[PDB]
Coordinates of C-alpha atoms and ligand atoms in Angstrom, one line a residue:
Chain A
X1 CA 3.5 6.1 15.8
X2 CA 5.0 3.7 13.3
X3 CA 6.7 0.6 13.0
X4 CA 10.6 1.4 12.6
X5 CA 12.3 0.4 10.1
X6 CA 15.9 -0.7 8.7
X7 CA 16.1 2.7 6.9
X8 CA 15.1 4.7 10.0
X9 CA 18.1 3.1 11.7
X10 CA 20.4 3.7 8.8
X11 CA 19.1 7.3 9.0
X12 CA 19.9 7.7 12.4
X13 CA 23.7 6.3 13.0
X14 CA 24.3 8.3 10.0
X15 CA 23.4 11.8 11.5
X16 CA 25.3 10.5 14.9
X17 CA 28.2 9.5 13.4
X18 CA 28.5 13.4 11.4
X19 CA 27.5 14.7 15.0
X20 CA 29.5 13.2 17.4
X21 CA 31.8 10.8 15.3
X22 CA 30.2 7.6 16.0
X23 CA 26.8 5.6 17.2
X24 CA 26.2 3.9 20.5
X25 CA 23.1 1.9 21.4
X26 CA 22.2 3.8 23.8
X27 CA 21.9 7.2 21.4
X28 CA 20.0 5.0 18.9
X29 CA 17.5 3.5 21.5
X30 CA 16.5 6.9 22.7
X31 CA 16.6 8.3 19.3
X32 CA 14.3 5.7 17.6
X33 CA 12.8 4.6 21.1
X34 CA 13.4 1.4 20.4
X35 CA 14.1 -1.4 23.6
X36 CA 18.0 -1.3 23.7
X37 CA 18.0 -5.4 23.1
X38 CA 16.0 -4.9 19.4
X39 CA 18.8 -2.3 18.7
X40 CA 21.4 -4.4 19.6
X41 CA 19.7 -7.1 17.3
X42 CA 19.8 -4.5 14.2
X43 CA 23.5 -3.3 14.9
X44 CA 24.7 -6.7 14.4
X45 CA 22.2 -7.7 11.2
X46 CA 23.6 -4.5 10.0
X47 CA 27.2 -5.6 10.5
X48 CA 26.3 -9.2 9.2
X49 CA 25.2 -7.2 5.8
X50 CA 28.2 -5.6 5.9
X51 CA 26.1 -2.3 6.4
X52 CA 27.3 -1.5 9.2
X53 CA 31.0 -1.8 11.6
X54 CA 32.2 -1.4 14.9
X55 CA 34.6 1.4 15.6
X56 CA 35.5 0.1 18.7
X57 CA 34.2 -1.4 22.0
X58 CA 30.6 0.4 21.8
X59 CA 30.8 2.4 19.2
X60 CA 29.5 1.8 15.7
X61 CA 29.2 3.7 12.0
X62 CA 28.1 2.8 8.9
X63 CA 30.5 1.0 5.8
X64 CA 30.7 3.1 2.3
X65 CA 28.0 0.7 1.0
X66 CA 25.8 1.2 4.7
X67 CA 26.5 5.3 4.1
X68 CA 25.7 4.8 0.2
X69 CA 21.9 3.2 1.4
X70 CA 21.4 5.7 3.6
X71 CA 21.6 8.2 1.4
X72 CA 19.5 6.5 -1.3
X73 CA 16.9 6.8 1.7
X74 CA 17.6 10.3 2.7
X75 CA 16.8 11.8 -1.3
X76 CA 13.1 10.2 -0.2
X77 CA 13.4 11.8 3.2
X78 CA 15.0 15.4 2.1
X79 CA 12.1 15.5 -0.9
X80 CA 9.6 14.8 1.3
X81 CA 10.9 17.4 3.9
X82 CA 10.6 20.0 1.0
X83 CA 7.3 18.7 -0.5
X84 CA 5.9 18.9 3.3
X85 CA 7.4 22.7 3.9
X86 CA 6.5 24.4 0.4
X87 CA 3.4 22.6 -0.5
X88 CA 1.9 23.4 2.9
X89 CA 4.2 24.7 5.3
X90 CA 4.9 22.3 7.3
X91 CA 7.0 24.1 9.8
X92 CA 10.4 24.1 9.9
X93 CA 11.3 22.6 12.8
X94 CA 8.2 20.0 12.6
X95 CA 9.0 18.9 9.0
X96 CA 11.7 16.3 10.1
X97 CA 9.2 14.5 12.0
X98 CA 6.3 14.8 9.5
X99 CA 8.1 13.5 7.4
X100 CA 8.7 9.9 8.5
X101 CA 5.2 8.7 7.8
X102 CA 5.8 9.5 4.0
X103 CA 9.1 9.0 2.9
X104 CA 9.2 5.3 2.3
X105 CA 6.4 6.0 -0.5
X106 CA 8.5 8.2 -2.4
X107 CA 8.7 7.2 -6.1
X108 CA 11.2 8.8 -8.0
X109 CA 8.4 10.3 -9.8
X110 CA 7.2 12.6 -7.1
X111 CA 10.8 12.9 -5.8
X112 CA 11.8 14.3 -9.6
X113 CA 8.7 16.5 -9.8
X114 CA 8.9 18.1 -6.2
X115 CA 13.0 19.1 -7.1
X116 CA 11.7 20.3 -10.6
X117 CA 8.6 22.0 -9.1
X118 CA 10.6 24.3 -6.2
X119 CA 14.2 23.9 -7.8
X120 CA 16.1 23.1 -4.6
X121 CA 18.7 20.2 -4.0
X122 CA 18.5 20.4 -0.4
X123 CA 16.4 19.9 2.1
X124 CA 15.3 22.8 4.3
X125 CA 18.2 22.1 6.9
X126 CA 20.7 22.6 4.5
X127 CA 21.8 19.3 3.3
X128 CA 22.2 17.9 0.3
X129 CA 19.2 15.8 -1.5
X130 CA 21.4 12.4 -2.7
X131 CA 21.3 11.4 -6.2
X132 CA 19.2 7.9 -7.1
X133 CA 22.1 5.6 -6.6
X134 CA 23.3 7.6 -3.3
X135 CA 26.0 9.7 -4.1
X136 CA 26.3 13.5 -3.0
X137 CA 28.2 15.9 -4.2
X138 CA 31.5 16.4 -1.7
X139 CA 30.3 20.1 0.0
X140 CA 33.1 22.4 1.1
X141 CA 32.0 23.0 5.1
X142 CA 33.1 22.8 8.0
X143 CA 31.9 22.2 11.6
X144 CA 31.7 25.7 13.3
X145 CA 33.3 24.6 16.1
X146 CA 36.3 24.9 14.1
X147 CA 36.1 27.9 13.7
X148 CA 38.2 31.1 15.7
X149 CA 37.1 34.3 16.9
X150 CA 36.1 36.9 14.6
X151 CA 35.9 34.5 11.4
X152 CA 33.3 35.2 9.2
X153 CA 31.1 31.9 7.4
X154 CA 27.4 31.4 6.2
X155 CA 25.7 28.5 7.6
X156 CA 25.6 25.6 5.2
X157 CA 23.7 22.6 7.1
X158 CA 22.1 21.5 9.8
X159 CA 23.5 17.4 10.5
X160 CA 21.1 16.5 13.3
X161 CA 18.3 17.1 13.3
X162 CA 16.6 16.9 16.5
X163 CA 14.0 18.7 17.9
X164 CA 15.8 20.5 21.3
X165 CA 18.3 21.5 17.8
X166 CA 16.1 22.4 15.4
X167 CA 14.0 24.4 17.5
X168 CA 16.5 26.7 19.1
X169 CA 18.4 27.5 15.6
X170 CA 14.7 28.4 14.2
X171 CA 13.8 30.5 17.5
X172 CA 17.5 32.2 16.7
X173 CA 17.3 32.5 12.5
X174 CA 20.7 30.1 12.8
X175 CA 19.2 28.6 9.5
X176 CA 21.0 27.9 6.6
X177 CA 22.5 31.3 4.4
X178 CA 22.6 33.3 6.8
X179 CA 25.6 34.7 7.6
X180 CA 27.2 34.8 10.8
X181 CA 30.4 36.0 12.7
X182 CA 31.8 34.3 15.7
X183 CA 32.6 36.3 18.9
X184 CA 33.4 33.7 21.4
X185 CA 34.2 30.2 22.1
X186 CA 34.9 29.9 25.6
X187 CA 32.4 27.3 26.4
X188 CA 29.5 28.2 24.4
X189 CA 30.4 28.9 21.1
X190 CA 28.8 32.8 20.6
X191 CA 28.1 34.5 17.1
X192 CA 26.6 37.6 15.6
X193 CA 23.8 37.1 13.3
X194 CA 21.3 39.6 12.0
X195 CA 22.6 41.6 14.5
X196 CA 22.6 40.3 17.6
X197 CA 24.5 38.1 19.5
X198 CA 23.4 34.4 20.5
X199 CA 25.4 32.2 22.3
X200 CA 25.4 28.8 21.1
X201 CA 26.1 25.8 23.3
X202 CA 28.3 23.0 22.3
X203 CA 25.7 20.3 22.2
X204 CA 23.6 22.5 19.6
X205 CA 26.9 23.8 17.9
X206 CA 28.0 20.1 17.2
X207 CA 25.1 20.3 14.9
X208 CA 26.1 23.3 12.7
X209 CA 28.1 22.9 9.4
X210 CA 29.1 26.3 7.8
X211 CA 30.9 27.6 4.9
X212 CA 33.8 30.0 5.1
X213 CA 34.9 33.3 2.9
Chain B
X1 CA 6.2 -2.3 -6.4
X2 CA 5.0 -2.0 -2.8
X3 CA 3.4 -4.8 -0.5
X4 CA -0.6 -4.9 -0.7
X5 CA -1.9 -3.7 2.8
X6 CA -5.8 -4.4 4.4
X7 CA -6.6 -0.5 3.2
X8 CA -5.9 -1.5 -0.4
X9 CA -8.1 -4.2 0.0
X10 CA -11.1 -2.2 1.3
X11 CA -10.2 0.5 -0.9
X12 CA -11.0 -1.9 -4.2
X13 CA -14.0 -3.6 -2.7
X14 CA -15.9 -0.2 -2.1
X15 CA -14.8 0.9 -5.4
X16 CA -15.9 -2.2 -6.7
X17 CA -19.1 -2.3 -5.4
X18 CA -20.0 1.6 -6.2
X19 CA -19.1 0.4 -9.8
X20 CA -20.9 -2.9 -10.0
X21 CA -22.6 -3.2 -7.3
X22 CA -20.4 -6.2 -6.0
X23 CA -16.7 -7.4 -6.1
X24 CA -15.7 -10.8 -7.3
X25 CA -12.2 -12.7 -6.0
X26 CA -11.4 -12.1 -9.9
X27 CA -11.8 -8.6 -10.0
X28 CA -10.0 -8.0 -6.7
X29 CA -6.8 -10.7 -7.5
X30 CA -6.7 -8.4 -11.1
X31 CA -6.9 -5.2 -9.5
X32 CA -4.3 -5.9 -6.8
X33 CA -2.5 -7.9 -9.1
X34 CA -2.4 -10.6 -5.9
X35 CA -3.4 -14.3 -7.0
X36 CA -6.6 -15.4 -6.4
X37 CA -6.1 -17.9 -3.3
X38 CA -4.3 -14.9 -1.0
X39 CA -7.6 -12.6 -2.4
X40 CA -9.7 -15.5 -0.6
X41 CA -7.9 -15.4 2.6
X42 CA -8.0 -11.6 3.1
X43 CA -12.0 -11.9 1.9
X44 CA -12.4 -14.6 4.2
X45 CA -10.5 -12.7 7.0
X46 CA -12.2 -9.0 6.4
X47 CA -15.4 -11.1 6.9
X48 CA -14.2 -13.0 10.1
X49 CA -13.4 -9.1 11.3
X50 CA -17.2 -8.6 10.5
X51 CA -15.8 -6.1 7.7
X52 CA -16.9 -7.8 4.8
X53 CA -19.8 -9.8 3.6
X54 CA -21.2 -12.3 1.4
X55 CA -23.6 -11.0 -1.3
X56 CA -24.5 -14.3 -2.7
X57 CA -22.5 -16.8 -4.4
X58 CA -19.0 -15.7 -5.5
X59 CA -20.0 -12.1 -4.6
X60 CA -19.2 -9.8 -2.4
X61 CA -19.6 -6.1 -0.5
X62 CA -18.0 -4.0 3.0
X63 CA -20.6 -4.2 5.8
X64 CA -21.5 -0.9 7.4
X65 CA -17.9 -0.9 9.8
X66 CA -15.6 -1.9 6.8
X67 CA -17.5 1.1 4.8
X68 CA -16.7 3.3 7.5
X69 CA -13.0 1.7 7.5
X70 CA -12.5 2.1 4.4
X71 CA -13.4 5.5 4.8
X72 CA -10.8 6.5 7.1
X73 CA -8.1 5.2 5.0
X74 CA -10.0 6.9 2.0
X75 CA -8.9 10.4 3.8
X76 CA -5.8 9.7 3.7
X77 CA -5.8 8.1 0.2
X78 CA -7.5 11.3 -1.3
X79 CA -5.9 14.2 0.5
X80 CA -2.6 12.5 -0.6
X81 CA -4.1 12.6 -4.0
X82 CA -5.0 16.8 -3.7
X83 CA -1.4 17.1 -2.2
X84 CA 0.4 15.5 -5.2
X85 CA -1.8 17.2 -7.8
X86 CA -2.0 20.3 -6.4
X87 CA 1.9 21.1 -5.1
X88 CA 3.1 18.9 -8.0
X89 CA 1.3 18.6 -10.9
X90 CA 1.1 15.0 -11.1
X91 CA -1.5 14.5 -14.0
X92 CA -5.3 14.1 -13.0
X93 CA -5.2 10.6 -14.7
X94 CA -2.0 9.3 -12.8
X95 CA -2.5 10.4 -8.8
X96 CA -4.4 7.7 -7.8
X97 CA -1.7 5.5 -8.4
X98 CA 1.0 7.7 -7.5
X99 CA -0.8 8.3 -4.5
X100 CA -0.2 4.6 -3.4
X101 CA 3.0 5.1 -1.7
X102 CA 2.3 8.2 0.9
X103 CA -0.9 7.7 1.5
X104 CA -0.2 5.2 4.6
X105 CA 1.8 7.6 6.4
X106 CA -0.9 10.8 5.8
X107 CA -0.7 12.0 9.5
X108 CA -3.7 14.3 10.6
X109 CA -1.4 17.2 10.9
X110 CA -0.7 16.5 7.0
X111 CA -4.1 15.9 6.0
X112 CA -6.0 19.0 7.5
X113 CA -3.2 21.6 6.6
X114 CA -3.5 20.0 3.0
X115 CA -7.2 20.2 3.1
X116 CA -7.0 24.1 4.4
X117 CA -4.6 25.0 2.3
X118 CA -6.0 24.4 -0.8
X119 CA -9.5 25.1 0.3
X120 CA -10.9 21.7 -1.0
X121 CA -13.6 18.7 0.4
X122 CA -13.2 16.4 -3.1
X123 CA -10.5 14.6 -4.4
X124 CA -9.6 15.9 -8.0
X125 CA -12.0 13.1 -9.1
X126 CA -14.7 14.6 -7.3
X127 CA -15.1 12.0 -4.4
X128 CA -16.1 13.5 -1.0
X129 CA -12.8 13.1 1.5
X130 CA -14.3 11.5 4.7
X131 CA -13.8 12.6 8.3
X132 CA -11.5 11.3 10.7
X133 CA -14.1 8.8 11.6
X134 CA -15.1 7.9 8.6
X135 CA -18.2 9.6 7.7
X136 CA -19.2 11.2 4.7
X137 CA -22.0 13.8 3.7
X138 CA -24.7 12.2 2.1
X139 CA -24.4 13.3 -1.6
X140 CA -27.6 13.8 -4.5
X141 CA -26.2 12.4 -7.2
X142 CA -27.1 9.5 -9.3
X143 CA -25.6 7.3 -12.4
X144 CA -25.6 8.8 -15.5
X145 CA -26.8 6.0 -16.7
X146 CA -29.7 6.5 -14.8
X147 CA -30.6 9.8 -17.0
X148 CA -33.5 9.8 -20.3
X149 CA -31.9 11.9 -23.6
X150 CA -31.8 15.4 -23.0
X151 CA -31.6 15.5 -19.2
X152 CA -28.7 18.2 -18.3
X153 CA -26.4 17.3 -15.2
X154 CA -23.1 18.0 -13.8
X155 CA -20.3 15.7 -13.2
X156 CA -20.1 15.0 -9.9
X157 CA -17.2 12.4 -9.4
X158 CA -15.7 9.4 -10.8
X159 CA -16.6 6.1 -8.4
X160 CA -14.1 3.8 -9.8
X161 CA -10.5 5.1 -10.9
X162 CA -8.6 2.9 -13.4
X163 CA -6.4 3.5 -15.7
X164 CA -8.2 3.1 -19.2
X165 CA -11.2 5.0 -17.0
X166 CA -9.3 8.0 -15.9
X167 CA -7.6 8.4 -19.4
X168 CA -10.9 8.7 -21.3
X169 CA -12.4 10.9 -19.2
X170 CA -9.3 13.2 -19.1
X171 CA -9.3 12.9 -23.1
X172 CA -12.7 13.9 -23.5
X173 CA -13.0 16.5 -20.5
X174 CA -15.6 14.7 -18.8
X175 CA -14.1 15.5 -15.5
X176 CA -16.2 17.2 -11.7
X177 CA -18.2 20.5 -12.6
X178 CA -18.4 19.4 -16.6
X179 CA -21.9 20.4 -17.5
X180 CA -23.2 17.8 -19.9
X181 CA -26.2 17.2 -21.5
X182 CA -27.3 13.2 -22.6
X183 CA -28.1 12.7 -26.6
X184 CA -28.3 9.4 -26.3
X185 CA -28.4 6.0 -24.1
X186 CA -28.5 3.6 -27.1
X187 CA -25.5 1.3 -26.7
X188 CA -23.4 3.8 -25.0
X189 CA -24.0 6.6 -23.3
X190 CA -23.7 9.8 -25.9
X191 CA -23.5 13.3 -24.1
X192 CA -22.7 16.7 -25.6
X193 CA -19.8 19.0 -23.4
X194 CA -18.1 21.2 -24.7
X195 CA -20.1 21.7 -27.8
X196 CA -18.7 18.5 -28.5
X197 CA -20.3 14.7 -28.6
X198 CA -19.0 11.8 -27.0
X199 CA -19.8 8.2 -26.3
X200 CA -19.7 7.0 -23.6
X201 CA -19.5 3.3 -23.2
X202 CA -21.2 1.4 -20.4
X203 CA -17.8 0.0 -18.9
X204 CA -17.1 3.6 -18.6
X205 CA -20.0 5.5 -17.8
X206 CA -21.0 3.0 -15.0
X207 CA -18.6 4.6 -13.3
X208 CA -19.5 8.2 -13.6
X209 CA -21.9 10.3 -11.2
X210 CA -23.7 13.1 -12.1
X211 CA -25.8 16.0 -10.7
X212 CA -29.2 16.7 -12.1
X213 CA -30.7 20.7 -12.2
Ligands
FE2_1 FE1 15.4 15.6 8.1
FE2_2 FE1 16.3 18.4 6.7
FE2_3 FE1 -8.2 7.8 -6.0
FE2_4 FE1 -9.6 10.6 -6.7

């Protein structure tokens, strides 16, 4: 669809790097479909701006000052995720996608007017919308992967946001407030909500952030 | 604040010419705010694309496939515009510009859930919003400068949307589905509305379209 940017990168080893601790070129290059060469051309720029740093031997995340730009990206990405859901319902799991054409355009004008208009400060997956100067406040979650058998939490955010992910928590209400309990972790990680009992599996439950009682 | 594009280019020259019945390299450098030598090398490109043409001397107009052009991007231009007044509240008087930003990344799937939504086929300034193609019911209206003194119309929309333009016509409530009535044409256009009367000066009314009964 359209041309990708250095924000859409930013965006993306962000969201890896909470998922699965770190970005490889690979994940990116199938992520923003992208030619692996052009995101090996971007990892370095990004490292050259000092944006960007290698973990080790293919592995990359963002600096404080990359993470800090990426955030002052995702308070146009968030707002526009909410502006696209409660304006016209935009649905859930589509509204990450529908998004990207109108982020970049986000003035804080509309962004200020869409928070004061539905009073949120996050987006509809649960995470927080970044300030102008890309701070967030620090959240107290955790992954639930960390979590034991029979421990009770109420899911705070969603981290990736993919559409495999996305989809499956909305087909299972596994949306953020709504409280769960886990019942297994033997290889999928299983929980009661609203009821009934959904086993999640670890590629999908890498995703989930909760908050404990 | 953001980069001029090819749309905003075709946008102004339509405008322009619905207005005046031409647009100048002048009027499109001050509009843009773009200097005058890159304004001749768009115009001179747009009509190498057979887009554009020359009127006559220093003047200039969209040929039938730049209309149609221009058009398309006019969809996404004014839906953007209905989505940010509507959800948001951005004032009548300021959504054309605050419209700049989004409006390149108004996907289909954003555009026609907007347009049902909110039940609408005008832009809050009454302009028709074209079809995917670019085509637009033919309207019957006329210039209001066009009328004799006591002729009663509606307003139908507002051609050209700048800011000292907009702001009158907010002040003084002469905004689409205003019944007005025309007192006089001497120097300016005087109408009553609202049991009140206003001139109208040319600069102003040149750009406003009515609907006679
Ligand atoms: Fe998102
Ligand atoms: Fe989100
Ligand atoms: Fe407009
Ligand atoms: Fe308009």
């Amino acid at each position: 669809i359209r041309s990708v940017t250095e924000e859409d990168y930013l965006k993306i080893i962000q969201e890896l790097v909470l998922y699965k601790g770190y970005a490889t070129l690979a994940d990116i290059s199938r992520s923003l479909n992208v030619k692996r060469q052009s995101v090996r051309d971007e990892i370095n720029h990004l490292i050259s701006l000092s944006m960007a740093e290698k973990i080790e031997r293919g592995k990359y995340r963002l600096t404080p000052s990359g993470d800090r730009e990426a955030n002052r990206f995702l308070r146009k990405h968030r707002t526009a995720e909410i502006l696209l859901s409660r304006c016209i319902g935009i649905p859930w799991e589509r509204v990450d996608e529908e998004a990207m054409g109108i982020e970049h355009g986000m003035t804080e004008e509309i962004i200020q007017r869409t928070i004061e208009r539905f009073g949120v400060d996050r987006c509809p997956h649960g995470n927080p919308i970044p300030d102008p100067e890309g701070n967030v406040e620090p959240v107290a979650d955790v992954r639930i992967t960390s979590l034991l058998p029979d421990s009770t939490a109420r899911i705070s955010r969603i981290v990736y946001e993919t559409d495999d992910i996305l989809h499956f928590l909305a087909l299972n209400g596994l949306i953020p407030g709504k409280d769960i309990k886990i019942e297994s972790v033997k290889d999928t990680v299983r929980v009661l909500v609203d009821g009934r009992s959904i086993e999640i599996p670890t590629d999908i439950a890498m995703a989930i952030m909760v908050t404990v009682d």
